[PDB]
Structure 1
Amino acid sequence: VEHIPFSHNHYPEKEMVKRSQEFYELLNKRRSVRFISNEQVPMEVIDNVIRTAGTAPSGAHTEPWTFVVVKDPDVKHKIRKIIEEEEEINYMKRMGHRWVTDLKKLRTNWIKEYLDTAPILILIFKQVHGFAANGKKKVHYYNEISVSIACGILLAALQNAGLVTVTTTPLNCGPRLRVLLGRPAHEKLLMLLPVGYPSKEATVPDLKRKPLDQIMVTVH
């Protein structure tokens, strides 16, 4: 493969500060929203939002991500049955006292109404390896990190397009959800995002983010 010159849009120092400031204020309004309206969302916003995720870097240019988008209420309800079943066992037994205590501030439990109400579910699967045209396995270097980076870009895109979601990681729901949606064995579910508008009764925990001097360290 050939190498080509890199073409860049140069911004004046003042334009950069402004764009960077606005983008921060924009994304800082993003909250994980666990209460989602059933009102339909324009499918072109979803398409672009996933196109964008696919612009993520990936280890050795492997693109090890599958974004499975579920619209069908029937399928969605089967997903809800599975996750609620496993989460109940997760809260009652598998996560442990410490974890369950650490979640009190979020008031979450194994009841997940948004899996039904949200018009759209995005299930993100990592490809723990891939296949070339000849059918031999190609290695997916840092696939979990690559897909997660892509999930970050997906989250920014949803915020930018004015939709809401919550990044969820349903423990022990992977194999079952994989089988239900007909995904191949080399795919493993990494996380699930319900996407839509906030329902009228939406709340969030009153969480505070660290001040800059607590996430950033400058060295001299």
Structure 2
Amino acid sequence: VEHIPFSHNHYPEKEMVKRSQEFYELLNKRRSVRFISNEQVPMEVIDNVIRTAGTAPSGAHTEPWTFVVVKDPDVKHKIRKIIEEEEEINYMKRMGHRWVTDLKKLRTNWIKEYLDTAPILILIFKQVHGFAANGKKKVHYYNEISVSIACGILLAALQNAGLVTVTTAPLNCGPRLRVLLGRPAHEKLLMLLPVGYPSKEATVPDLKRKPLDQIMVTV
């Protein structure tokens, strides 16, 4: 592959400052929403936020991500059963006292109503390796990180398109969900995001973010 000049949209410092400020205020309104209405949402928006996630950087340009989108309530209902069953055992046995306590402030449990109500579920699978065209294996360097970075971009894009979600990690649900969705073995489930509009009645926990001087260190 050949290398080409990079061209760059410049801004005056004054407009950089302003774009950076608006975008802070925009993403700072983002909250994880666990109560999602059944109102349908336009698929062109979903298509576009996925395509935005696909602009992410990736280790050695491997693009190791598969975004699986479910609209079908029958499929969504099987997903729900799998996750509620597995999470009930997670909460009652596998997570441990300390994790369960650390979650009290969030009021989460194994009941995940959003898996039926939300019109869209996005299941983000990482590809632990890939395949060349001749069927031999290719290495996916830093695949989990690459996929999580694209997930961060996806979240930004959703916030900026006026949709809500909550990033979830359905512990011990990977295999059953992979099989149910007909995905191949080199894909593993990394996170699941219900997507739509908030419910009229949606709450969030009243959490504060750290001030800049507790996350940023200069030298």
TM-score (norm 1): 0.99
C-alpha distance in structure 2 between counterparts of 1:9 and 1:82, whole Å: 47
2:7 equivalent to 1:19 = no
Q: Report the Cα offset of residue 48 of structure 1.
A: 0.2
Encode CA deviations 1:102-138: one digit per residue, 9 max, x unaligned. Answer: 0000000000000000000000000000001111000
**Structure 1 regions of 5+ residues with no counterpart?**
none
C-alpha distance in structure 1 between counterparts of 2:21 and 2:148, whole Å: 25
Runs of 4+ with deviation above 4 angstroms: none
C-alpha distance in structure 1 between counterparts of 2:79 and 2:201, whole Å: 23
Q: Secondary structure at the match of 1:45?
A: helix
Encode CA deviations 1:54-94: one digit per residue, 9 max, x unaligned. Answer: 00000000000000000000000000000000000000000
Q: Report the Cα offset of residue 147 of structure 1.
A: 0.2
Q: Report the Cα offset of residue 174 of structure 1.
A: 0.2
Q: Secondary structure at the match of 1:193?
A: strand
Q: Report the Cα offset of residue 95 of structure 1.
A: 0.2
Q: Secondary structure at the match of 1:122?
A: strand
Q: Report the Cα offset of residue 139 of structure 1.
A: 0.0
2:93 equivalent to 1:93 = yes
Encode CA deviations 1:143-198: one digit per residue, 9 max, x unaligned. Answer: 00000000000000000000000000000000000000000000000000000000
C-alpha distance in structure 2 between counterparts of 1:56 and 1:139, whole Å: 18
Alignment of structure 1 residues 67-216 onto 2, 5 Å? 67-216=67-216
Q: Secondary structure at the match of 1:108?
A: coil
Q: Secondary structure at the match of 2:192?
A: strand
C-alpha distance in structure 2 between counterparts of 1:72 and 1:86, whole Å: 21
Q: Secondary structure at the match of 2:66?
A: strand
Equivalent residues, number? 219
C-alpha distance in structure 2 between counterparts of 1:9 and 1:201, whole Å: 42
Q: Report the Cα offset of residue 27 of structure 1.
A: 0.2
C-alpha distance in structure 1 between counterparts of 2:10 and 2:145, whole Å: 30
Encode CA deviations 1:21-41: one digit per residue, 9 max, x unaligned. Answer: 000000000000000000000
**Structure 2 regions of 5+ residues with no counterpart?**
none
C-alpha distance in structure 1 between counterparts of 2:167 and 2:36, whole Å: 13
Q: Report the Cα offset of residue 209 of structure 1.
A: 0.2
Give identity over the alignment, percent. 100
TM-score (norm 2): 1.00
